[PDB]
Write a protein that binds this ligand. Structure first.
Ligand SMILES: NCC(=O)c1ccc(Br)cc1
Length: 330
């Protein structure tokens, strides 16, 4: 089997991407944030505290003939941005772009933090990291991908995020029309439950490539590119007027600037992030200070190849017995 679904930025900045997901019988379609940095499929639901729902589409398990309460199971998750959600668990039929999994754990939110409430476009998350991170207790649950794996033509999914445009998540096959050149594969460590890999270095604009190992995770659920302070300093040093602002919470730059590209290494291959991808617009409405799309990972504890990086590539998440990541230009 295979699946193919279009993923759409939630706003003009590509702050996140939503992908339609069919849950239950008859189908209830929710727009979920596919997140290769976490491993819970959770949704706004009929059980979510009413004051914490503001515009989201909710899953109502009582209206699904295939929904079954997973007795005694609860979940609770906190994300890197400080957001959180928790609730109980159903199993139900979940379909993504024609690919169907029965008995998928669908984690029903009883509580969500303010940032989720305030984002009316995201109805939940579909986690695509390794199932070892799944927060369901006392019986850990498998991700949609893990459940689908055996049925897939090939044990892979691919992320093809658009810049200010729709893109595609495919399951079970590699679309050879979707990228240019060849896909370069690189080793993955699953030890932290992430799609963790090691970039071979970077370049800023037309500058020389710096060969240096950068261990990080491929995370579709993180907006920006978070890299070591040395790297990030070297990037923003090429932008007149750019500075790290503690009040804003990162590097900002004059909105009048033209940003240089940023290249990262994948083995001997190179992925180029155009400068425009690194512009996240005025820090506040009407401001001439713009927020940078490349930020320091200092204090995070890990480097994160978020959407800013991933949307510059066709990315293969290879879930074979020994997982790997593949990157191609496009
Ligand atoms: N990885 C965390 C994530 O995907 C996320 C998405 C939307 C909000 Br609001 C907060 C967090």
């Amino acid at each position: 089997s295979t699946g193919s679904a279009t993923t759409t930025p939630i706003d003009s900045l590509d702050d996140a991407y939503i992908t339609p997901v069919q849950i239950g019988t008859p189908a209830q379609t929710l727009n979920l944030d596919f997140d290769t940095g976490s491993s819970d499929l959770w949704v706004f639901s009929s059980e979510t505290t009413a004051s914490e729902v503001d515009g989201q589409t909710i899953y109502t398990p009582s209206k699904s003939t295939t929904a079954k309460l997973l007795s005694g199971a609860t979940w609770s998750i906190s994300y890197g941005d400080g957001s959180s959600s928790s609730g109980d668990v159903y199993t139900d039929t979940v379909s993504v772009g024609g690919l169907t999994v029965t008995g998928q754990a669908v984690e029903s939110a009883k509580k969500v933090s303010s940032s989720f409430t305030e984002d009316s476009t995201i109805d939940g998350l579909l986690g695509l990291a390794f199932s070892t991170l799944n927060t369901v207790s006392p019986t850990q649950q498998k991700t949609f991908f893990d459940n689908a794996k055996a049925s897939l033509d090939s044990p892979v999914f691919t992320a093809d995020l658009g810049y200010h445009a729709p893109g595609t998540y495919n399951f079970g096959f590699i679309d050879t029309t979707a990228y240019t050149g060849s896909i370069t594969y690189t080793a993955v460590s699953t030890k932290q439950g992430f799609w963790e890999w090691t970039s071979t270095g970077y370049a800023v604009g037309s500058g020389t490539f710096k060969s240096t190992s950068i261990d990080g995770i491929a995370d579709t659920g993180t907006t920006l590119l978070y890299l070591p302070a040395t790297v990030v300093s070297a990037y923003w040093a090429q932008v007149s007027g750019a500075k790290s602002s503690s009040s804003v919470g990162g590097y900002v730059f004059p909105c009048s600037a033209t940003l240089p590209s940023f290249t990262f290494g994948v083995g001997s291959a190179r992925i180029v992030i155009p400068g425009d991808y690194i512009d996240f617009g005025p820090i506040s409405t009407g401001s001439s200070s713009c927020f940078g799309g490349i930020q320091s990972s200092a204090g995070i504890g890990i480097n994160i190849f978020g959407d800013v990086a991933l949307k510059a590539a066709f990315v293969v998440f290879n879930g074979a017995t020994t997982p790997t990541l593949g990157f191609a230009s496009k």
